Amino acid sequence: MNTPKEEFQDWPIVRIAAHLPDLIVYGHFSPERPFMDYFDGVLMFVDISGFTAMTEKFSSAMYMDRGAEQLVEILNYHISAIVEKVLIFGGDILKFAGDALLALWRVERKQLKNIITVVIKCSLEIHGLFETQEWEEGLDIRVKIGLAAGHISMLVFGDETHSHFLVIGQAVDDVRLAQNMAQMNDVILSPNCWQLCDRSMIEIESVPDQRAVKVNFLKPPPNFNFDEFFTKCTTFMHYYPSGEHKNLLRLACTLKPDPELEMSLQKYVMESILKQIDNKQLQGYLSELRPVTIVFVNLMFEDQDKAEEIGPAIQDAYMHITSVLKIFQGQINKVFMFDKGCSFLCVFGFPGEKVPDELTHALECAMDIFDFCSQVHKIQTVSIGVASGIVFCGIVGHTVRHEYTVIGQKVNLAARMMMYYPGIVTCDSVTYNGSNLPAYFFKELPKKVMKGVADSGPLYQYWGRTEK
């Protein structure tokens, strides 16, 4: 008999798995919401703000009507190469945002030392991709890498139809802190990472007024062979593609249909993405430069360093946020958590869900969320930034590992507003002027110099309907 080869690998469940890390795809969790788990690992945070700051050049008349299509293509060309490096070095890409990606090497405590060496090597090869790279006089095509290691907590929250996850705790805080100390082409180790690493492998230098360190060189011992060392390390990597599947970037490419598993995985993915995965919408429909309103919610916790406390609080906030967003087809695009603020990137006017009075509604929703979350047990401070304008939307990453992402000056502004004006609902000039609302509903704010924002315009507090 004949033996036709090639297993079919293009099932809906595989296409869904592209939008999720192995932490979720291979997770098998209890139904309780919230769900918490605890483990150890090495984290890599790759600052990609250098080439995602491109959103400005692609809004120009020079791109004719194809700014969004050109932007997604060039971003994915560069980001795909970073993803391949992380995946071949055995990492799990957790999440993408406009300005970063976060990757995880989950391992037993005894193996943290050797895995740090692997992740340092990966980081240096990432930098190597961008050595002679630019556009239109501008080698702003470089990255900044922060590494951390130690205890990691995972939180899964949601309802019967939607799920979200976060990694939290000190190593998570550390990796953000490490990456914001980095200059272009740097690899910064968190203080705990430096304490746990194989110091014989690396030459470091001090970071002024910091216990975190900069990797100058990976200079291994005389008898060292990285390839043999990496093969030993794969003993500890549960899902490293191997044997018959050594040619694949992810074991998740081999997932077979399983309705119970697919029911669980689909809850993490937006319905319009599922429509495209089901071949019920054109594959290019979601790449667009689209007017939206960003509602960026930040929740700060009473006891920030307690996972068992913050998980229920985030679940409670989430149940309210989701009910409020449903009323106006608002969507949670991302949830992120670092300086023990949990932040929800909410979007009004995504593709196929654009309501007319987007501005008035975004403000009313912001105030509703603000009032409710302010009364949630263990939530110390709620802060909400509201900004409106043209943003890039699209699926960003590699064919085998990608996520729908929103990128733009208005996303960065709403993020900055919630941090620089804590404890209140703020909005930009577009929102204020557009809203069908009387001027005494607002308070014109002092101008603050905010990181990455230049010419923010006048900013306002949404005070609400009454003096109170």
Ligand SMILES: COc1cccc(C(=O)c2nonc2N)c1
């Ligand atoms: C702000 O840019 C990012 C990019 C990738 C991940 C995060 C995150 O904060 C987390 N992702 O999962 N848990 C988190 N915490 C943030």
